[PDB]
A paper describes a structure:
Influenza viruses contain a single-stranded, negative-sense RNA genome complexed with RdRp, which comprises PA, PB1, and PB2 subunits. The virus acquires host primers required for transcription initiation through a “cap-snatching” mechanism. The PA subunit of influenza RdRp is a bridged binuclear metalloenzyme, with its N-terminal domain (PA-Nter) housing the endonuclease active site responsible for cleaving RNA segments.
Using an AlphaScreen-based assay, we determined the inhibitory potencies of more than 30 flavonoids, identifying luteolin (IC50 = 73 ± 3 nM) and its 8-C-glucoside orientin (IC50 = 42 ± 2 nM) as the most potent PA inhibitors. Furthermore, we performed structural analyses of PA-Nter complexes with luteolin and orientin, detailing their binding poses within the PA-Nter active site. Moreover, X-ray crystallography of the luteolin–PA-Nter complex clearly revealed that it binds to the endonuclease active site. The high affinity of luteolin can be attributed to surface complementarity and a strong hydrogen bonding network, evidenced by the well-defined electron density map of luteolin in the crystal structure. In luteolin, this C-7 phenolic group interacts with Glu-26 of the PA subunit. Our structure–activity relationship (SAR) study indicated that the 3′,4′-dihydroxyflavone motif is crucial for inhibitory activity against PA. The presence of phenolic groups at the C-5 and C-7 positions significantly enhanced anti-influenza activity.
Numbering used by the authors: -1 to 53, 73 to 196
């Protein structure tokens, strides 16, 4: 309710519109599952920030793209690099390291979400990078891909979001709602 308002105020309209569409495609109503709505918005925002954290066009964004375009990007990349085709769409491709990236944002402990992602992925080559809202991070082989300053920007954004939700008394419900 107030969470819906929070989302519409806190996130850029491009992000919010994407999230609304994404949820509706799974039969979920943004105006009802408002915690899910915020979580989806945050994860997308983190994918965009992450993609801007290195050199100009170091990263292809895959999250947020319609399915056809996403798989176009992915098949194309596996075709031009010989890198293995994932079973599920990842979040980005790193041109410098030549590997796909799965981004996780979690309210819980990072190690728990890291393991869930890892054992869902199956693809031996896709890098995993997990962020929490309380400034923790965890990445495959402890390789964090970006420099400390770019990661600090994400971590601080996430902290500010959590503080803002707390300010409005939404943080408790948000945190507990993660399944
Ligand atoms: O767009 C959605 C995106 C995702 C999602 C969740 C975690 C990830 O690490 C990720 O890369 C994507 O999960 C959802 C879960 C939903 O219930 C509805 C949605 O629209 C989404
Ligand atoms: Mg994704
Ligand atoms: Mn992800």
């Amino acid at each position: 309710g107030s969470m819906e308002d929070f989302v519409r105020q806190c996130f850029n309209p491009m992000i919010v519109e994407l999230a609304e569409k994404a949820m509706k495609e799974y039969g979920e109503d943004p105006k009802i599952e408002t915690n899910k709505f915020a979580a989806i918005c945050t994860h997308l925002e983190v994918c965009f920030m992450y993609s801007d954290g290195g050199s100009k066009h170091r990263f292809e964004i895959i999250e947020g793209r319609d399915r056809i375009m996403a798989w176009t990007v992915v098949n194309s990349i596996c075709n031009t690099t010989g890198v293995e085709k994932p079973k599920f769409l990842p979040d980005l491709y790193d041109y410098k390291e030549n590997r796909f990236i799965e981004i996780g944002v979690t309210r819980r402990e990072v190690h728990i979400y890291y393991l869930e992602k890892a054992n869902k992925i199956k693809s031996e080559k896709t890098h995993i990078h997990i962020f929490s809202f309380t400034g923790e991070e965890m990445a495959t082989k402890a390789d964090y891909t970006l420099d400390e300053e770019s990661r600090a920007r994400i971590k601080t954004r996430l902290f500010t979001i959590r503080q803002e939700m707390a300010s409005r008394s939404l943080w408790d419900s948000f945190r507990q709602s993660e399944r």
